[PDB]
Design a protein around this ligand. Structure first.
Ligand SMILES: [Ca+2]
Ligand SMILES: [Zn+2]
Lengths: 94, 498, 1280, 50
């Protein structure tokens, strides 16, 4: 993964696959490569802990809940606080 | 309201239309004119994520409001804190040569400083803005998966049901099961095209936001900045004791900044950001080549192989010879004992996949009698190219007995010819080219399930021939591509005989 | 080598030989006229023709208008000796123009030797001349001499623009249809021509001019000379053979008269309207006529009325009819010789083909009707020349057929009044109470050509008898410029028949013209009651009359048809609201800009469909524009097309009637094995023909009934588009005139510039519409017509299979031992289909011609194309601008297109632009491209010094290209000193640059409504908004020179400069970039041609920080990649990786087949290695274990049998384009692999490894087998 | 077709060439003053064509 690859928990819900050595994976890497390797889904997927960063509550005009959706955080620590405002771009290079 | 599906034929007709329609829905794009250019927009984007979805059309609303209208936090920028500009009071009395070359140093420091500022703006763009388009990309990709899943479940239920209770023959069910699997792959390949579409669409948008929104804030900040610098530098030079008036004017002129000193935008660089090793590796792993035949002569050895980077296995007669063809070494098949065979799970085809076959062929034409050249056939399904009369015959036959049998006139003159065959299930169209001409254009709506073996066999029975640059693609071929392939290969600097 | 070898003047006195008063045959007494013999057998009489036919001798307009679309009447025309002198000279010039073409040279020769047969004898033992084929030439002494002639050109009758062949008859014989022939009198005038509309060429000529174009009179004369040619050879098609049309339906023409002869003459698609069965009928008809002439000659034992010999005469006709003469002197006709001759006269001599030779704009079909008449003068060379016609070489007139554009070339064309009135012949179409009837008149030639079904006759249902003998008609190949060249080079130009002494005829020669059939004047003003608005209504609603009142656009057809101030538009309601609004003066220009943008946007709209096979694009606005099909939203049209196919475009659904095909019956041969097998083969051959026949037939029915409907729809869409432009202009012009003198004075508003812009938008729109409609027409063929033929054909194959098997089995006795092999032949042959290939039956559909048009399109948009050719640097564009080259300009000797400009006044190049191409506009888009190579900046004096290099500024307005430290700069400036700059920045603090001192490809494009864009190496770099810029008026010249550069040692390289009249798109720019990279020749690092015998430092694209070095010299040593390169610098100016560090490679000739020291792709070479300034040989011993062969540098004498020969390859690279490959080979031709490197311990050793040859082309960007060759260059210049 | 280079086997774009014919002896192609091609005796006079 090439973009925000330390934040992926927010962008993506991971689903885990079992890897057996050396039937799935050997000294040349995945048998049949990273795309077409045949891997079995892990029975553990259902044990994954789900703790949303925030929950979006969608109500109607009558103020009753239609749906409750989960947004997950990236896992990283935050702020504090704004870096760009207080950062001075160095004029002298040493 | 239709009568329920009973025949296997009815299942195929159903499954195929399910596939074509899914492809049409999911790969839908429209090109639009934007602030920064033309962008290929994913048509369903608004209906998927509820974004600019309050119109009757998301596309026109996006053309209207621009790339920045897709994200929730529009103004995140923070003008950076600078280091204010003062020219040392110790240079006030310097002689020209020394004053001169000391301001040259300050000039460079400054233009470097500009570059730093721009970088700072680019980082904020990435962190504040692209982050939001990447969220859109991910959610849009998830939407595609969610939809794909719905489709597969619909297909699986219908197959599961027919298998559960119907009079369909056991081994017809068997074929149905094998075939549907191939169709489910074809559906992922189509899903993949769509997930690439949303990546280009949204990446372009984010880059447009940098040109249209971030960049101009940078330019504002920079002309305030060089306006200041220009002032302080003019005021400094006037206060110079040890130089004359003609010197002051030439100096002020040498040291003055204008907008071009900080217009760093390079749109090609913006675009190149997203070409990573991974993006490249993915291109090469997922490209349309299922077979690319190469051959060359090592000392005491003839080498034949496949460059597609796929799983293709090659088995061939040990004594097969090589001869220079059009652009490279060609295989010589003697017609008697010599054969070569290529194995790839894609080769079996099915109901819904598209493919192209091409190669150069020179045939030392003798007999008129119908003879296998190359094809993939099992249980009397699949495709074959035959030598017949003076030409070739392309044959295509499905599990229900429906056939294409098409005579291509005058191909054995013992001159090289470029054969191109294109099978397109989305347009239900067969295209056959010989050299730079289009010899057949036909409907194949009547041909259903062509599932064959995973082996293509090059026999060339009874007709010694030369074969070069054999290729199989998982996509159809257009006339522009054929012409381009044909002529590009043809000028290698060699002059040719009749 | 001229056709007319005397230059006559009308007042020249009569000599009795080539200038005389002459009598032509006539019914009664005829008054002698002054004529000129311009060539043997060819005379010109510069007189209005009242003599040919005393019946119609009055030059006034007739009581009832002729039913043609265009006519002109002036009785005084050609009554003056001056006009006569000009007629003579014009006609002569046209003869010369025709003769100067290969095709015309044949035709003219054919006509001369086409002497009318001597059929006068009622006694077949004698050969006599026919009187009406002669004239009497009055001598100065009062006597007349009788003389025979082939051709006379005479002035027109009462209708000045009606040109035709006339000739005299015989009491019994038909001389034009019996192969005898008769002297031809053509009514013609070179002093007028026709105007017409053309939308088709916009594909190849996007700049095509607006409004009417003028027919090149040379085409018109040629047309008549072709008729004359038929008539002289007696092969003209009977005038009662006519193409009938259906006139009864509201949308159909009231009537149209066109004859098979005319169709034959036009050529092209018009001639393909005549089916095979009938084309055959004719060929056979005239062949037998020819055979008759052979037998008439054979029985003629003496000659009468001449001093010439029967020998000579019989030979005259042997050479005219291409007769074969045996040893005895008997004549016959060879079917092979005849086929060739009849083919030349009817398929080679055609209007279509002459157009191909003249290279002029001309109607593609008779169904594109002349819309106007024009007075012209072709006699002065400044007007019209023999070689170029109206489109004069090396001038604006040479481009896009401007010479024929009546508005651009307006001094050569004066609009006369068409005598055919407004709605002279029409139909009246009325919608019913959608409030009472709203009726409109529709011009007859605005209606649909719908050919009658009794026009297409076929024998398809007639069975045949296959026979041991039965044999195969040939392919019947299509006519092409190379076939014509075949006839040309075999043509005999030597022998013209003499002008013989003949017995004097009577003083008056008695005869009358051949009778023409009387044609019913078709009905006029037929009325029709309709329930729904038609296409004609929708189009009519788009029109307005000029006036002082302000018109408004409406989306209501009803409103528009009801009110003179309301014009219907198919544009969006948004466009409607905007164009109608009263606009403040201060907002007027921005308002216009928006309108021009919106216009271009809506007319350029193209929806792509991925759902259906043969139609890729759809133009959705065609629906509301013509009311195609019905209902409301244009989304209905896109939808209905996708669903129902192309049939929704058609006004009527054509009948395609293909019957049960006639089956084969085989004649049995008892006990004869060889005959029985031949019969079987013949039946199969004739079966292949049955397929070709059915395909020809359908193609023929499609050209006539379908492709003609689509061609009309197309013409109407252009009419629709032009109406929309006129309306929008009228509304804008009204708004401007509402302003005060003071307000106007602050708005520079040029309606001609705005018109020019909208006309370009209409052209872009027509390009798309053209493609869409072509695909539509073809789709209907493939899908809705061909299949009926294929069904009838497969049923035929089935019947034949049963017959053939029955024949084999019945004959099993004769055929014994062969029965199985024959079954297979029959079952295998007849189980195939023969695929329909459209490219086989018609000209325009070949795949290559699509790419061809694209190339043309870019070449015809080039208003300056500056190349070095022969010994000079010139402009290869049709404008041929002048180039002035300074004394200090330097040209690279190896490639002379590479131009070096130093910093000196003398080092400069000046282009003097033709006025028509100097840029002065608010709205006009334009692009420039060129390659440049900029030396590194070595010195602080180059810092903050911007200097111009390409200058098109005039009084602070124009464009220019300028450079600065790490910058390439484009500047635009209007006449108000408002400017825009766009720049490409590149750093000099970089390890290795894609730019510094390297050839770069620059492209700048300018859209006046939007943006100025700069591209580098094919990619978009930066864009800036220009729409706030007013009128830009650039310089009359372009100055290439260094202007303002304070670095005295500075210079630049530049090559391949182009100026384009449009905004290049991304695709065109990339294709441009690729095409000009010269992929057939290897390049060095700098971008120059790679060379032999030139030392190069080496760089591996995989690890640029590394250079090549030699561990040890000799077979026990090796070469490797070393590092780091180290750096070179000048503080504040550049910091770079040193490029001159390493071992040097020199490429030596091995197999090279010439001496130009350039390294081409696939050259076979040796590579020498420079180590401590000595030369060695790059080699390996490929026998070493392992696929990676470690390369060594060897003593040149000691290389022995080692692998040395290297095959050089040139590959494409992104942003560099410098990729070089080397494939090492042993001495048996085997591959040792490409040169590359491999890690051994921690050493990276140069290797030849076949692992590379197993790889596809570009894989990643990181190869290891891709190299760069760096020569020492003044532009980089570190210390070696 | 003959090449100035003995080692050259295949004919390429832009090669310099001598055209020869076998009649009785070997005849080589030259250009006359009328620009008409003719077979001659002497390889030296042979014209080198591109
Ligand atoms: Ca109106
Ligand atoms: Zn005519």
């Amino acid at each position: 993964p090439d973009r925000f690859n330390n934040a992926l928990k927010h962008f993506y819900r991971k689903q885990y696959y079992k890897i057996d050595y050396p039937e799935n994976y050997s000294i040349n890497g995945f048998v049949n490569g990273q795309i077409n390797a045949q891997l079995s889904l892990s029975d553990r997927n259902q044990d994954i802990i789900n703790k949303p960063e925030e929950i979006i509550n969608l109500l109607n005009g009558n103020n009753v809940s239609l749906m409750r959706s989960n947004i997950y955080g990236d896992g990283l620590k935050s702020t504090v606080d704004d870096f760009y405002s207080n950062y001075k771009i160095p004029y002298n290079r040493a | 309201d239709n009568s329920p599906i009973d025949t296997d034929k009815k299942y195929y007709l159903w499954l195929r239309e399910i596939f074509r329609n899914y492809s049409f829905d999911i790969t839908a794009t429209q090109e639009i004119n934007t602030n920064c250019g033309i962008n290929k927009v994913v048509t369903w984007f608004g209906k998927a994520l509820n974004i600019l979805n309050t119109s009757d059309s998301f596309v026109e609303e996006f053309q209207n409001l621009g790339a920045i209208s897709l994200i929730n936090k529009k103004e995140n920028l923070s003008m950076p804190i600078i280091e204010s500009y003062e020219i040392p009071n110790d240079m006030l009395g310097l002689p020209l040569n020394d004053l001169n070359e000391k301001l040259f140093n300050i000039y460079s420091k400054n233009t470097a400083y500009f570059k730093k500022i721009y970088y700072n703006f680019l980082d904020q763009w990435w962190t504040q803005y692209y982050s939001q388009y990447f969220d859109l990309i991910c959610m849009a990709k998830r939407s595609v998966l969610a939809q794909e899943t719905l489709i597969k479940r619909i297909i699986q239920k219908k197959l599961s049901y027919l298998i559960g209770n119907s009079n369909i023959s056991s081994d017809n069910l068997a074929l149905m099961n094998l075939t549907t699997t191939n169709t489910l792959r074809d559906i992922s390949n189509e899903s993949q095209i769509a997930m690439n579409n949303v990546d280009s669409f949204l990446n372009n948008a984010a880059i447009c936001v940098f040109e249209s929104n971030i960049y101009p804030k940078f330019i504002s900040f920079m002309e305030q900045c060089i306006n200041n610098i220009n002032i302080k530098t003019k005021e400094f030079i006037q206060k110079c004791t040890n130089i004359n008036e003609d010197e002051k004017l030439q100096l002020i002129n040498q040291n003055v900044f204008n907008s071009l000193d900080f217009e760093f935008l390079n749109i090609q660089n913006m675009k190149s950001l997203f070409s990573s090793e991974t993006a490249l590796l993915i291109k090469e792993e997922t490209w349309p080549y299922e077979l690319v035949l190469y051959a060359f002569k090592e000392p005491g050895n003839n080498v034949i192989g496949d460059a597609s980077g796929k799983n293709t296995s090659i088995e061939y007669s040990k004594d097969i010879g090589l001869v220079y063809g059009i652009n490279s070494d060609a295989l010589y098949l003697n017609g008697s004992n010599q054969s070569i065979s290529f194995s790839n799970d894609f080769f079996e085809n099915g109901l819904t996949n598209s493919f192209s076959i091409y190669f150069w062929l020179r045939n030392l034409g003798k007999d008129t009698i119908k003879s296998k050249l190359i094809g993939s056939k099992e249980d009397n399904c699949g495709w074959e190219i035959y030598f017949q009369d003076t030409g070739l015959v392309f044959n295509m036959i499905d599990s229900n007995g429906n056939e294409k049998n098409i005579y291509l006139s005058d191909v054995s003159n013992n001159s090289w010819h470029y054969i191109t065959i294109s099978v397109d299930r989305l347009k239900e169209q067969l295209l056959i080219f010989i050299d730079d001409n289009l010899v057949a254009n036909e409907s194949i709506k009547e041909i259903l399930n062509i599932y064959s073996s995973n082996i293509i066999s090059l026999l060339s029975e009874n007709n010694p021939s030369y074969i070069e640059g054999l290729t199989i693609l998982n996509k159809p071929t257009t006339s522009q591509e054929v012409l381009s392939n044909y002529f590009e290969v043809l000028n290698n600097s060699y002059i040719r005989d009749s | 080598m001229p056709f007319v070898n005397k230059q006559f003047n009308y007042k020249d006195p009569v000599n009795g030989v080539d200038i005389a008063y002459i009598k032509i045959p006539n019914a009664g007494q005829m008054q002698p006229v002054k004529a000129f013999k311009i060539h043997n057998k060819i005379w010109v009489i510069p007189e209005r023709d009242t003599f040919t036919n005393p019946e119609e001798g009055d030059l006034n307009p007739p009581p009832e208008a002729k039913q043609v679309p265009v006519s002109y009447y002036d009785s005084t025309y050609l009554s003056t000796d001056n006009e006569k002198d000009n007629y003579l000279k014009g006609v002569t010039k046209l003869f010369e123009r025709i003769y100067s073409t290969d095709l015309g040279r044949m035709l003219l020769t054919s006509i001369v030797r086409g002497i009318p047969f001597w059929g006068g004898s009622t006694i077949d033992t004698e050969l006599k001349v026919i009187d009406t084929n002669c004239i009497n030439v009055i001598q100065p002494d009062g006597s007349y001499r009788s003389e025979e002639l082939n051709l006379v050109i005479i002035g027109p009758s009462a209708d000045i623009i009606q040109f035709e062949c006339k000739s005299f008859g015989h009491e019994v014989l038909n001389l034009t249809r019996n192969g005898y022939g008769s002297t031809q009198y053509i009514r013609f005038s070179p002093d007028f021509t026709f105007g017409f509309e053309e939308s088709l060429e916009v594909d190849t000529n996007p700049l095509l001019g607006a409004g009417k174009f003028a027919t090149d009179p040379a085409v018109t004369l040629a047309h008549q000379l072709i008729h004359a040619g038929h008539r002289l050879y007696g092969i003209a098609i009977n005038p009662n053979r006519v193409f009938k049309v259906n006139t009864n339906a509201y949308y159909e023409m009231s009537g149209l008269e066109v004859s098979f002869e005319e169709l034959r003459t036009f050529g092209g698609h018009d001639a393909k309207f005549i089916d095979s069965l009938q084309e055959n009928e004719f060929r056979l008809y005239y062949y037998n006529k020819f055979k008759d002439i052979a037998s008439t000659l054979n029985k003629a034992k003496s000659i009468v009325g001449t001093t010439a010999s029967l020998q000579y005469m019989k030979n005259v006709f042997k050479e005219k009819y291409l007769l074969s003469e045996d040893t005895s002197g008997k004549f016959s006709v060879d079917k092979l010789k005849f086929d060739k001759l009849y083919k030349m006269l009817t398929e080679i001599y055609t209007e279509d083909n002459f157009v191909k030779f003249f290279k002029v704009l001309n109607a593609k079909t008779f169904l594109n009707f002349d819309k106007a008449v024009f007075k012209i003068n072709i006699v002065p060379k400044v007007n019209y020349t023999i070689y170029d016609g109206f489109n004069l070489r090396n001038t604006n007139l040479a481009a896009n057929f401007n010479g024929q554009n009546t508005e651009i070339n307006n001094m050569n064309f004066t609009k006369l009044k068409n005598f055919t009135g407004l709605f002279e012949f029409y139909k009246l179409l009325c919608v019913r109470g959608i409030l009472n009837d709203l009726c409109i008149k529709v011009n007859n030639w605005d209606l649909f050509f719908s050919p009658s079904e009794d026009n297409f006759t076929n024998d398809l249902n007639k069975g045949e008898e296959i026979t041991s003998d039965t044999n195969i008609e040939a392919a019947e190949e299509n006519i092409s410029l190379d076939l014509i060249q075949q006839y040309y080079l075999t043509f005999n130009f030597d022998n013209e028949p003499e002008n013989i002494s003949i017995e004097n005829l009577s003083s008056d020669i008695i005869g009358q013209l051949e009778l023409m059939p009387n044609i019913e004047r078709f009905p006029n003003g037929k009325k029709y009651e309709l329930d729904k608005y038609t296409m004609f209504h929708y189009l009519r609603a788009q029109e307005f009359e000029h006036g002082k009142s302000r018109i408004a656009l409406t989306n209501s057809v009803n409103e528009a048809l009801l009110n003179p101030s309301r014009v219907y538009t198919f544009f969006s309601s948004d466009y409607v609201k905007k164009v109608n609004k009263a606009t403040e003066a201060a907002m007027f220009l921005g308002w216009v800009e928006q309108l021009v943008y919106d216009f271009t946007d809506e007319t350029s709209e193209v929806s792509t469909t991925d759902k259906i096979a043969d139609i890729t694009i759809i133009i959705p606005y065609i629906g509301p524009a013509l009311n195609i099909g019905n209902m409301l939203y244009k989304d209905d049209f896109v939808g209905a097309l996708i669903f129902s196919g192309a049939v929704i475009l058609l006004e009527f659904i054509p009948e395609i009637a293909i019957p049960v095909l006639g089956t084969f019956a085989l004649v049995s041969y008892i006990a004869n094995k060889v005959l029985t097998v031949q019969t079987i083969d013949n039946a199969l051959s004739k079966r292949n023909e049955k397929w070709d026949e059915v395909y020809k037939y359908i193609v023929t029915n499609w050209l006539a009934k379908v492709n003609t409907q689509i061609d009309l729809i197309r013409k109407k869409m252009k009419e629709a588009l032009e109406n929309q432009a006129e309306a929008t202009k009228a509304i804008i012009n009204y708004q401007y005139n509402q302003y005060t003198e003071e307000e106007k004075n602050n708005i520079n508003f040029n309606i001609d510039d705005l018109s020019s812009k909208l006309n370009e938008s209409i052209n872009k729109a027509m390009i798309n519409i053209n493609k869409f409609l072509n695909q539509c027409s073809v789709s209907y063929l493939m899908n809705s017509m061909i299949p009926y033929g294929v069904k009838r054909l497969e049923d035929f194959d089935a019947s034949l299979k049963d017959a053939l098997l029955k024949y084999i089995y019945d004959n099993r006795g004769t055929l014994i031992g062969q029965v199985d092999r024959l079954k297979d032949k029959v079952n295998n042959t007849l189980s195939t289909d023969i695929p329909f290939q459209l490219s086989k039956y018609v000209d325009n559909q070949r795949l290559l011609s699509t790419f061809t048009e694209y190339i043309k399109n870019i070449i015809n948009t080039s208003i300056l194309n500056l190349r070095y050719e022969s010994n000079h640097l010139i402009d290869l564009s049709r404008y041929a601008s002048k180039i002035n080259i300074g004394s200090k300009v330097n040209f690279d000797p190896i490639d002379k297109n590479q131009i070096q400009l130093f910093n000196l006044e003398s080092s400069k190049i000046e282009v003097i632009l033709k006025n028509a191409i100097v840029y002065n506009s608010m709205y006009e888009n334009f692009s420039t491209s060129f390659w440049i190579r900029i030396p590194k900046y070595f010195n602080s004096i180059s810092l903050n010094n911007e200097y111009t290099i390409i200058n098109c500024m005039e009084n602070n307005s124009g464009w220019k290209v300028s450079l600065n430290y790490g910058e390439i700069i484009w500047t635009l400036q209007d006449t108000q000193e408002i400017k825009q700059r766009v720049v490409f920045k590149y750093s000099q603090m970089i390890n290795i640059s894609d730019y510094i001192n390297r050839w770069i490809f620059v492209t700048i494009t300018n859209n006046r409504l939007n943006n100025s864009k700069i591209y580098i190496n094919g990619r978009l770099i930066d864009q800036k908004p220009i729409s706030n810029l007013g009128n830009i008026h650039a310089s009359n010249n372009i100055m290439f020179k260094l202007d303002g550069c304070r670095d005295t040692h500075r210079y630049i390289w530049i090559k391949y400069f182009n100026l384009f009249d449009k905004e290049l798109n991304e695709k065109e720019i990339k294709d441009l970039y690729d095409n000009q990279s010269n992929s057939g020749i290897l390049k060095d690092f700098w971008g120059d041609y790679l060379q032999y015998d030139k030392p190069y430092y080496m760089l591996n694209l995989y690890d640029p920080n590394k250079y090549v070095d030699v561990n040890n010299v000799g077979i026990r040593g090796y070469m490797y990649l070393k590092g780091p390169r180290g750096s070179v610098m000048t503080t504040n100016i550049y910091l770079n990786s040193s490029l001159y560090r390493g071992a040097k490679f020199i490429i030596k000739k091995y197999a090279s087949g010439n001496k130009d020291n350039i390294v081409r792709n696939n050259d076979r070479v040796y590579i020498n290695v420079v180590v401590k300034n000595k030369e060695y040989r790059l080699a390996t011993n490929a026998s070493q274990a392992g696929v990676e062969k470690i390369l060594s540098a060897l003593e040149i004498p000691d290389v022995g049998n080692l692998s040395q020969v290297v095959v050089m390859k040139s590959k494409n690279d992104q942003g560099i384009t410098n990729k070089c490959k080397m494939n090492l080979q042993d001495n048996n031709g085997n591959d040792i692999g490409f040169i590359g490197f491999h890690q051994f311990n921690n050493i990276a050793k140069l290797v030849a490894s076949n692992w590379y040859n197993r790889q596809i082309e570009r894989s990643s960007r990181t190869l290891g087998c891709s190299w760069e060759f760096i020569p020492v260059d003044d532009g980089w210049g570190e210390r070696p | 077709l003959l090449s100035i280079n003995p080692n050259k086997q295949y004919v390429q774009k832009l090669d310099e060439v001598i055209i020869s014919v076998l009649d009785n002896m070997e005849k080589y192609i030259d250009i006359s003053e009328d620009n008409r091609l003719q077979l001659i005796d002497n390889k030296n006079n042979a014209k080198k064509m591109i």
